[PDB]
Design a protein around this ligand. Sequence first.
Ligand SMILES: [Cl-]
Lengths: 12, 12, 12, 12
Amino acid sequence: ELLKKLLEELKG
Amino acid sequence: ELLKKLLEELKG
Amino acid sequence: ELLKKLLEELKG
Amino acid sequence: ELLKKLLEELKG
Ligand SMILES: [Cl-]
Protein backbone atom coordinates (compact mmCIF):
# COMPACT_ATOMS: atom_id res chain seq x y z
CA GLU A 1 0.00 0.00 0.00
CA LEU A 2 2.83 2.45 0.68
CA LEU A 3 3.94 2.08 -2.95
CA LYS A 4 0.34 2.48 -4.17
CA LYS A 5 0.19 5.81 -2.26
CA LEU A 6 3.50 7.00 -3.76
CA LEU A 7 2.45 6.05 -7.29
CA GLU A 8 -0.96 7.70 -7.04
CA GLU A 9 0.72 10.95 -5.95
CA LEU A 10 3.16 10.81 -8.90
CA LYS A 11 0.13 10.23 -11.14
CA GLY A 12 -1.73 13.18 -9.62
CA GLU B 1 -1.82 11.22 -19.99
CA LEU B 2 0.63 8.49 -21.02
CA LEU B 3 2.46 8.95 -17.73
CA LYS B 4 -0.81 8.89 -15.78
CA LYS B 5 -1.77 5.61 -17.52
CA LEU B 6 1.63 3.98 -16.94
CA LEU B 7 1.76 5.04 -13.26
CA GLU B 8 -1.76 3.63 -12.86
CA GLU B 9 -0.56 0.32 -14.36
CA LEU B 10 2.43 0.20 -11.99
CA LYS B 11 0.07 0.88 -9.07
CA GLY B 12 -2.11 -2.04 -10.17
CA GLU C 1 13.44 13.09 -30.65
CA LEU C 2 11.01 13.69 -27.78
CA LEU C 3 9.41 10.28 -28.45
CA LYS C 4 12.84 8.62 -28.71
CA LYS C 5 13.96 10.03 -25.35
CA LEU C 6 10.62 9.01 -23.78
CA LEU C 7 11.06 5.43 -25.03
CA GLU C 8 14.69 5.28 -23.83
CA GLU C 9 13.65 6.44 -20.34
CA LEU C 10 10.72 3.97 -20.21
CA LYS C 11 12.96 1.02 -21.15
CA GLY C 12 15.92 1.89 -18.94
CA GLU D 1 15.03 11.51 -15.01
CA LEU D 2 12.16 10.85 -17.43
CA LEU D 3 10.61 14.18 -16.46
CA LYS D 4 13.97 15.94 -16.88
CA LYS D 5 14.36 14.52 -20.40
CA LEU D 6 10.83 15.62 -21.40
CA LEU D 7 11.55 19.15 -20.15
CA GLU D 8 14.89 19.10 -22.08
CA GLU D 9 12.96 18.19 -25.24
CA LEU D 10 10.48 21.05 -24.72
CA LYS D 11 13.41 23.47 -24.21
CA GLY D 12 15.20 22.32 -27.36
CL1 LIG E 1 18.79 28.61 -20.12
